[PDB]
């Protein structure tokens, strides 16, 4: 009815609750980091499955699909963390998973605490802007499509048409509430700017990840296989700036 079919479809393909499988009996640095990595493994599997039902995605060359997933993995994860924190704990806690909800107390380490403060920016903006699920779902797809190789994608044409249709869908999502043209136009600017700023934010997560990855044995932190492959295959390249981040505003 009032809800555009594409948005309803996106709602229906959202993943079910994902647990970190964290141990609540026995916590610590490596323990917390290991659980977060376990959660990361389950999240990656979720994004891949999700991408198989995302209208238009399966039509892109297979290599582009793999590349886009790996490129956006961290971004989609932190964005999802932002949504969950916003929806379950009014953004006042980091809701990584039902069995892994972190607050100030569980962030003893200055390095980890700083990282969390950075992630906290998303939930906070979600609360400030009062993002709707309709808007979040469309923004999530745009995130998936927010970075491309320097030489571009193999299915570049199809990629741009897809990005455009989801940009039009984000506008429709905004139209659901923001009825005014001036207000709806200003809201489009705010949401797309939030997406632009994610590049800077995620860079910090990428670096923290790679550093912990390299010192995994010494830090006693386990990194599951699927995620390990994403980190080994693209993070060094991404941190070195060997990719093309897409921006809505120059």
Ligand X SMILES: C[C@@H](C(=O)N(C)C)N(CC(F)(F)F)c1ccc(C#N)c(C(F)(F)F)c1
- Contact set with ligand X (CB under 6 A): 33, 36-37, 39-40, 43, 74, 77-78, 81, 96, 115, 119, 205, 208-209, 212, 221
| Smallest separation, CB 138 to its own copies (Å) | 30
Of 211, 220, 246, 247, which one interacts with its own copies (CB under 8 A)? Answer: 211
Q: Does 33 bind its own copies (CB under 8 A)?
A: no
Q: Which of its own copies, ligand X, none interacts with 241 (beta carbon under 5 to 8 A by kind)?
A: its own copies
Q: Does 236 bind its own copies (CB under 8 A)?
A: yes
The residue (of 59 and 215) whose beta carbon lies closer to ligand X is 215
Buried b (16+ CB within 10 A) or exposed e, 215-249: ebeeeebbbbeebbebbeebbeebeeeeeebeeee
The residue (of 182 and 218) whose beta carbon lies closer to its own copies is 218
Q: How many angstroms separate the Cα of 15 from the Cα of each of 19, 48, 142, 165?
A: 12, 11, 17, 22
Residues in 188-207 that interact with its own copies by CB under 8 A: 203, 206-207
Please state, in angstroms and rounded to a whole number, the distance separating the CA atoms of residues 80 and 99. Answer: 16
Q: Is 84 annotated as a binding residue?
A: yes
Tell me which H or E stretch contains 92: none
Q: Which of its own copies, ligand X, none interacts with 205 (beta carbon under 5 to 8 A by kind)?
A: ligand X
Candidates 105-113, 135-143, 161-169, 232-240; binding stretch for its own copies (CB under 8 A)? 232-240
Q: How many angstroms separate the Cα of 221 from the Cα of each of 108, 216, 217?
A: 17, 5, 6
* Cβ neighbours of residue 73 closer than 8 Å, sequence gap 6 or more: 44, 47, 227, 230
The residue (of 23 and 63) whose beta carbon lies closer to ligand X is 23
Please list every residue in the chain followed by a chain break, i.e. its C lies more than 2.5 Å from the next written N: 26
**Residues 12, 83, 165, CA angle at the centre, nearest 5°?**
55
Query: What six digits make up the tokens of 5?
Result: 């079919």
User: Which residues are part of a known binding site for progesterone?
Assistant: 84
Q: Which residues bind its own copies (CB under 8 A)?
A: 203, 206-207, 210-211, 213-215, 218, 231-232, 235-237, 239-242
């Amino acid at each position: 009815q009032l809800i555009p079919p594409l948005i309803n479809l996106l709602m229906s393909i959202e993943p079910d609750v994902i647990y970190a499988g964290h141990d609540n009996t026995k916590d610590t640095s490596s323990s917390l980091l290991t659980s977060l990595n376990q959660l990361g493994e389950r999240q990656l599997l979720s994004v891949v499955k999700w991408s198989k039902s995302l209208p238009g995605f399966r039509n892109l060359h297979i290599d582009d699909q793999i590349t886009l997933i790996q490129y956006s993995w961290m971004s989609l994860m932190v964005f999802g963390l932002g949504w969950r924190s916003y929806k379950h704990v009014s953004g006042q806690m980091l809701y990584f998973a039902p069995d892994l909800i972190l607050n100030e107390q569980r962030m003893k380490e200055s390095s980890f605490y700083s990282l969390c403060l950075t992630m906290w920016q998303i939930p906070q903006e979600f609360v400030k802007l009062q993002v709707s699920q309709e808007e979040f779902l469309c923004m999530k797809v745009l995130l998936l499509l927010n970075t491309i190789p320097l030489e571009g994608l193999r299915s570049q044409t199809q990629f741009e048409e897809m990005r455009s249709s989801y940009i039009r869908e984000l506008i429709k999502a905004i139209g659901l509430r923001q009825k005014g043209v001036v207000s709806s136009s200003q809201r489009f600017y705010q949401l797309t700017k939030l997406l632009d700023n994610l590049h800077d934010l995620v860079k910090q997560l990428h670096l923290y990840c790679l550093n912990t990855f390299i010192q995994s044995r010494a830090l006693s932190v386990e990194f599951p296989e699927m995620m390990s492959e994403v980190i080994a295959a693209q993070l060094p390249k991404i941190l070195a700036g060997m990719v093309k981040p897409l921006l809505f505003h120059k």
